């Protein structure tokens, strides 16, 4: 009843948003027929900002052209959830000396904006507009950047798919039957199709890296508190065991570094003193000195697809030819880190704070049985845990960690994560590494299957638990040779997560594959430096 | 559960006293052999000189690293006979003396360590029986960087049992006494550090802080101490009683005679060595331009926090430093943090005792309970229903005891997240209030003067001026300003307290007969801005004690 009314009123807001967008771009295109839209969109962000700084391209020109593309791609992707109205007034009042002057920036729905709903796919958050912009949006406006639209998220944001009962289902710009990723699926679909040159997204299980790999764009996940989490909307507040991180999303890695340099200014540390005043170290990013790179083709938990395995080896061979030393490195106790530390950290209360948002609301099929399993009693979760332990160890250990704990059990878990963080650093020091090469979950999965393939977060959620800066960059396209070899895929366990993932990665010719890059905590510039190296060797067209 | 007795704890303390006695014997044999070699070496001229002039004469070559070592080592031995602040002498330090890097910033500097800092082949007992007879395999990160910067760690300082008290007494190493007065407490939990530096045994030291453990002994003994942001320095290797507690942030910092030595210690620690060995700490360089800045500051201040009544000595110290800052050219604004009782009663007490002290009481199993902790142990051991029953009964009469006892109850993981979110919301609250008055720095009346023996554990509410900024994770420092006059101690009969419970009665009695004792002031800056905090601490020190600069 209430969920039905909230969905109907949200769709009216979306219709009004798209109608305002369409009438604004036609107003600009007819008044400015001299402007070339094709050369505008193909132009990289680094070439875009210098033409905006000099005055070759007006802030009005770059804004409504990208807005025109954003509205056109939304027809087949359904990624834009709300259009920000007062963006046209911000355009005229943009600071010239800002690093991102006249840059249209897409925002995830969790990023609160003045006079806009941060629904997150829930009914209780619908009809509650934010009365103030969040710190990271504030500094974008202070740095000249103009946020234009909000992007769609999956219900509750706790899934790497992208669908909600309020605004609908987001689709991959490359293939209709495929998921655009999540929970920044709206960001991936928009930037991947060329609707936005720059974007922002959150991450706690891989929410930046998933849609970036699925759509073929670059996304960075910084350390827990490298950027301001103030003003950000979520379902569970106070979860510190698994570190939540917000980061940039763009077409190329060079655009991510300029975004990070802009946000890491005086204005961020003034508006949020809780974030350490770490400036963007240009010296570390621009570095060309040979790196000692750790690598692994598989984490022995989730079997990589033929497209993933080929992408990891090709990057390795290109880096070896460049002069970088590649050393086989694998983190200790990975299944232990995912099953009881990562899953136990996110669900220490049994999901009781999480399920509070689902009271009197529809459940989206993209989540799957995620809600039905969490609603089970603590004794019923434990009973099925030791019963299915000899059958499938993955589902059993995950279900036991989704049980409610006490305050004593949380500290025991918090200390174990602190011990695990130091243990991997001990291995990082012993092997003497600068950066880490990791396969990224690819290619794009089918619609309503990511929620049923839980184990696939293994390559991403590990570095949320570790709180390591992780970033992804598209390196190759899925050749029909790789898609054919998906028939020999079986998995190490053969449980439901391996069965669904086998079917979901099929029929994926033309989809992009990315590779994950991991550096030591607080080293975002070093992570981006390696991301710059991987991109240059694999896709020389960019940069 | 079956009682194991105290027999295991008795033998552990017997072996702990021996390690203390043998240390002093090794210290005595070392300083006597040096004095026979150097008869014309001036000791009083060596000790009186500040660390800044000491490090300059060590870098130039005027004074040998051996000369400054054995002079301070002998002074540390002499003051220990009246203070009892040294637990153990680090045997492998004379080898480090010759191995100390000449180009290091702290070259040839004798540095005292708190027992929580783990040293290779040395016990970090913390006052507990189970922690003794358990030597550390390697030095901790912050001790490693001291050795890399040329500093020579030589002694472990005394701590109260479990470190959860601002007194300083343990059943294994004994009781620490204030170098200024015998009957007075030297502070805690870095009470050994305060007593050693305050008397002149150590020019520089390190200590932990989660409720004011750097700031308390600094004010009680009359020395400078800085508590930075929780994650500004490495916590790796630091031994504690409880692990996994992230609600209230644990912080570590420098302790010295003057403020200029604290900034040199922070600059030496903040180097490539620290960030490599512990990547969890952000690579923030020590901003010299901020510390050396002589620009006028917008300073917030308050005479009282409306929770714990300041002594006439505290009131006088706060006003005197406030007025002299105004004469310098600084603008002083009446500022008070919102909902202080909320931060202490339910956020700090609830954060530190989320499990009801269940992991904390694990260390006290079959071990002695030191009188300096008071009834803290007996209160924690009570069941959840008994803690709740007394909370409802004491609420109408004693509001402070009701909220503290209720927050010391075991809760679920759901309630911990709500609490941890309430802390970061409160952190954003005071930050928003900070901007509203557009402050640069904050001035707080630090708890003073020194309390009596075995009274700090019975006067819980006194941590109100210190634990507030552990909950807020604000870098706070302490600098001595003035001593107690005959008029200050005489006005203690007029002292009553804002609540009139047992905490105000004991604190009234504990601050009596305090003529001559030092009283300090607290300086608070915004998170991650401890270099700005020291800049203000330098301004306070220069205007109140110009002889230190
Ligand atoms: C975005 O970071 N994101 C959060 C949820 C996610 C991945 C997508 O990570 C944790 C998790 C845990 C379970 Br039991 C099921 C699904 C996810 O997905
Ligand atoms: C060192 O920071 N330190 C820890 C214990 C202390 C002060 C000294 O702070 C917390 C606390 C809590 C209670 Br209920 C009683 C006493 C203290 O002291």
Coordinates of N, CA and C in Angstrom, one line a residue, chain A residues 135 225-226 230-231 236-241 269-279 281 344-349 352-353 356 404-408 410-412 414-415 418 421-422 425 429 520-523, chain B residues 231-232 235-236 242-247 276-285 287 350-355 357-359 362 410-414 416-418 420-421 424 427-428 431 435 526-529 531:
Chain A
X135 N 29.5 16.9 1.9 CA 30.8 17.5 1.8 C 31.5 17.3 0.5
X225 N 38.9 6.3 5.0 CA 38.7 7.7 5.3 C 39.7 8.6 4.6
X226 N 39.8 8.4 3.3 CA 40.6 9.3 2.4 C 39.7 10.4 1.9
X230 N 30.8 12.1 5.2 CA 29.8 12.9 5.8 C 28.7 13.3 4.8
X231 N 27.4 13.2 5.2 CA 26.3 13.5 4.3 C 25.8 12.4 3.4
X236 N 22.7 0.9 6.9 CA 23.3 0.6 8.2 C 24.3 1.6 8.6
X237 N 24.1 2.3 9.7 CA 25.1 3.3 10.1 C 25.9 2.8 11.4
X238 N 27.2 3.0 11.3 CA 28.0 2.6 12.4 C 28.9 1.3 12.1
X239 N 28.8 0.8 10.9 CA 29.5 -0.4 10.5 C 31.0 0.0 10.2
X240 N 31.9 -0.3 11.0 CA 33.3 0.1 10.8 C 34.3 -1.0 10.6
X241 N 33.8 -2.2 10.9 CA 34.7 -3.4 10.7 C 35.1 -3.6 9.2
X269 N 39.2 19.4 3.8 CA 39.7 19.3 5.1 C 39.2 20.3 6.1
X270 N 38.7 21.4 5.5 CA 38.0 22.5 6.2 C 36.6 22.1 6.6
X271 N 35.9 21.6 5.5 CA 34.5 21.2 5.7 C 34.4 19.8 6.4
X272 N 35.4 19.0 6.4 CA 35.5 17.8 7.2 C 36.9 17.5 7.7
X273 N 37.1 17.9 9.0 CA 38.4 17.8 9.6 C 38.8 16.3 10.0
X274 N 37.8 15.4 10.0 CA 37.9 14.0 10.3 C 38.8 13.3 9.3
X275 N 38.8 13.8 8.1 CA 39.6 13.3 7.0 C 41.0 13.9 7.1
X276 N 42.1 13.1 7.2 CA 43.5 13.6 7.3 C 43.9 14.4 6.1
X277 N 44.5 15.6 6.3 CA 44.9 16.5 5.2 C 46.0 16.0 4.4
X278 N 45.7 14.9 3.6 CA 46.7 14.4 2.7 C 46.5 15.0 1.3
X279 N 47.4 15.8 0.8 CA 47.3 16.4 -0.5 C 47.6 15.3 -1.6
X281 N 49.6 13.6 -4.0 CA 51.0 13.5 -4.3 C 51.2 13.3 -5.8
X344 N 31.0 -11.6 8.3 CA 30.7 -11.4 9.7 C 30.7 -10.0 10.1
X345 N 31.6 -9.2 9.5 CA 31.7 -7.8 9.7 C 30.5 -7.0 9.3
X346 N 30.0 -7.3 8.1 CA 28.8 -6.6 7.5 C 27.5 -7.0 8.2
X347 N 27.5 -8.3 8.7 CA 26.3 -8.8 9.3 C 26.5 -9.3 10.7
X348 N 27.0 -8.4 11.6 CA 27.3 -8.7 13.0 C 26.0 -8.7 13.8
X349 N 25.0 -8.0 13.4 CA 23.7 -7.9 14.1 C 22.7 -8.9 13.6
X352 N 19.6 -7.1 11.3 CA 18.4 -6.5 11.9 C 18.2 -5.0 11.7
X353 N 19.3 -4.3 11.6 CA 19.4 -2.9 11.2 C 19.1 -2.8 9.7
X356 N 15.3 -3.6 8.8 CA 14.4 -2.5 9.3 C 13.9 -1.6 8.2
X404 N 23.4 -12.9 14.6 CA 23.6 -11.8 15.5 C 24.7 -12.1 16.6
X405 N 25.4 -11.1 16.9 CA 26.5 -11.2 17.9 C 26.4 -10.2 19.0
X406 N 27.2 -10.4 20.1 CA 27.3 -9.4 21.2 C 28.4 -8.4 20.9
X407 N 28.5 -7.5 21.9 CA 29.5 -6.4 21.8 C 30.9 -7.0 22.0
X408 N 31.0 -8.1 22.8 CA 32.3 -8.8 23.0 C 32.7 -9.5 21.8
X410 N 32.0 -8.7 18.7 CA 32.4 -7.7 17.7 C 33.8 -7.2 17.8
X411 N 34.3 -7.0 19.1 CA 35.7 -6.7 19.3 C 36.6 -7.8 19.0
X412 N 36.2 -9.0 19.3 CA 37.0 -10.2 18.9 C 37.2 -10.3 17.4
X414 N 36.8 -7.5 15.4 CA 37.5 -6.3 15.0 C 39.0 -6.4 15.2
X415 N 39.4 -7.1 16.2 CA 40.8 -7.4 16.4 C 41.4 -8.4 15.4
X418 N 42.1 -6.5 12.3 CA 43.3 -5.7 12.6 C 44.6 -6.6 12.5
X421 N 44.9 -7.5 8.7 CA 45.5 -6.4 7.9 C 47.0 -6.3 8.0
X422 N 47.5 -6.6 9.2 CA 48.9 -6.6 9.5 C 49.6 -7.8 8.9
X425 N 50.1 -7.2 5.2 CA 51.2 -6.2 5.1 C 52.6 -6.8 5.4
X429 N 55.5 -6.8 2.8 CA 56.9 -6.4 3.1 C 57.9 -7.5 2.8
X520 N 49.1 -0.4 -1.1 CA 49.0 -0.3 0.4 C 48.1 0.9 0.9
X521 N 47.6 0.8 2.1 CA 46.7 1.8 2.6 C 47.2 3.2 2.5
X522 N 46.3 4.1 2.2 CA 46.6 5.6 2.0 C 47.5 5.9 0.8
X523 N 47.7 4.9 -0.1 CA 48.4 5.1 -1.3 C 47.5 5.0 -2.5
Chain B
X231 N 45.0 7.9 15.1 CA 45.8 7.2 14.0 C 46.8 8.1 13.4
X232 N 47.4 9.1 14.2 CA 48.5 9.9 13.7 C 49.8 9.2 13.9
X235 N 50.0 2.4 16.3 CA 49.5 1.6 17.5 C 50.0 0.2 17.4
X236 N 50.7 -0.2 16.4 CA 51.2 -1.6 16.1 C 52.3 -1.9 17.1
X242 N 42.6 -4.8 26.6 CA 41.5 -5.1 25.7 C 41.8 -4.8 24.2
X243 N 41.4 -5.7 23.3 CA 41.7 -5.6 21.9 C 40.4 -5.5 21.1
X244 N 40.4 -4.7 20.0 CA 39.2 -4.6 19.1 C 38.3 -3.4 19.4
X245 N 38.6 -2.6 20.5 CA 37.9 -1.5 20.8 C 38.2 -0.3 19.9
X246 N 37.2 0.1 19.1 CA 37.4 1.2 18.1 C 36.5 2.4 18.3
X247 N 35.5 2.2 19.3 CA 34.6 3.3 19.6 C 35.3 4.6 20.1
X276 N 56.2 3.2 6.5 CA 56.6 1.9 5.8 C 56.3 0.7 6.7
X277 N 56.8 0.8 8.0 CA 56.5 -0.3 8.9 C 55.1 -0.4 9.3
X278 N 54.3 0.7 9.3 CA 52.9 0.6 9.6 C 52.1 1.5 8.6
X279 N 51.7 0.9 7.4 CA 51.0 1.6 6.4 C 49.6 2.0 6.7
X280 N 49.1 1.6 7.9 CA 47.7 2.0 8.4 C 47.7 3.4 8.8
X281 N 48.9 4.0 9.2 CA 49.0 5.4 9.5 C 49.2 6.2 8.2
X282 N 48.4 7.2 8.0 CA 48.5 8.1 6.8 C 49.8 8.9 6.8
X283 N 50.4 8.9 5.6 CA 51.8 9.6 5.4 C 51.7 11.1 5.5
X284 N 51.4 11.6 6.7 CA 51.3 13.0 6.9 C 52.6 13.6 7.5
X285 N 53.3 14.5 6.7 CA 54.5 15.1 7.2 C 54.2 16.1 8.2
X287 N 54.1 19.5 9.6 CA 54.0 20.8 9.0 C 54.7 21.9 9.9
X350 N 30.1 4.0 27.6 CA 29.5 3.0 26.8 C 30.4 2.4 25.7
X351 N 31.3 3.2 25.2 CA 32.3 2.8 24.2 C 33.4 1.9 24.8
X352 N 33.9 2.3 25.9 CA 35.0 1.5 26.6 C 34.5 0.2 27.3
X353 N 33.2 0.2 27.7 CA 32.6 -0.9 28.3 C 31.3 -1.4 27.6
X354 N 31.5 -1.7 26.3 CA 30.3 -2.2 25.5 C 30.0 -3.6 25.9
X355 N 31.0 -4.4 26.2 CA 30.7 -5.8 26.6 C 30.5 -5.9 28.1
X357 N 32.7 -4.9 30.2 CA 34.1 -5.1 30.7 C 34.4 -6.6 30.8
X358 N 33.7 -7.4 30.0 CA 33.9 -8.9 30.0 C 35.3 -9.3 29.5
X359 N 35.8 -8.7 28.5 CA 37.1 -8.9 28.0 C 38.2 -8.2 28.9
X362 N 38.9 -10.4 32.0 CA 39.6 -11.6 31.7 C 41.0 -11.6 32.2
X410 N 26.6 -5.1 29.1 CA 26.8 -5.8 27.9 C 25.6 -5.6 26.9
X411 N 25.9 -5.2 25.7 CA 24.9 -5.0 24.7 C 25.2 -5.8 23.4
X412 N 24.2 -5.8 22.5 CA 24.4 -6.5 21.2 C 25.2 -5.8 20.2
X413 N 25.5 -6.4 19.1 CA 26.3 -5.8 18.0 C 25.5 -4.7 17.3
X414 N 24.2 -4.8 17.4 CA 23.3 -3.8 16.8 C 23.4 -2.5 17.6
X416 N 26.0 -1.6 19.4 CA 27.3 -1.1 19.3 C 27.4 -0.2 18.0
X417 N 26.8 -0.6 16.9 CA 26.8 0.2 15.7 C 26.0 1.5 15.9
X418 N 24.9 1.5 16.6 CA 24.1 2.7 17.0 C 25.0 3.6 17.8
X420 N 28.4 3.6 17.9 CA 29.5 4.1 17.1 C 29.1 5.1 16.1
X421 N 27.9 5.1 15.7 CA 27.3 6.1 14.8 C 27.0 7.4 15.6
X424 N 30.3 9.4 15.9 CA 30.7 10.1 14.7 C 29.7 11.2 14.4
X427 N 30.9 13.8 16.9 CA 32.1 14.4 16.4 C 31.9 15.5 15.3
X428 N 30.8 15.2 14.5 CA 30.4 16.2 13.5 C 29.7 17.4 14.1
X431 N 32.3 19.8 15.7 CA 33.0 20.4 14.5 C 32.1 21.5 13.9
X435 N 33.0 25.6 13.8 CA 32.9 26.5 12.6 C 31.9 27.7 12.9
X526 N 41.6 21.0 16.1 CA 40.8 20.2 15.3 C 41.5 18.9 14.9
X527 N 40.8 17.8 14.6 CA 41.3 16.5 14.2 C 42.4 16.6 13.1
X528 N 43.5 15.8 13.3 CA 44.6 15.8 12.4 C 45.5 17.1 12.3
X529 N 45.2 18.0 13.2 CA 45.9 19.3 13.3 C 46.6 19.5 14.6
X531 N 49.9 19.8 14.9 CA 50.9 20.7 14.6 C 50.4 22.2 14.9

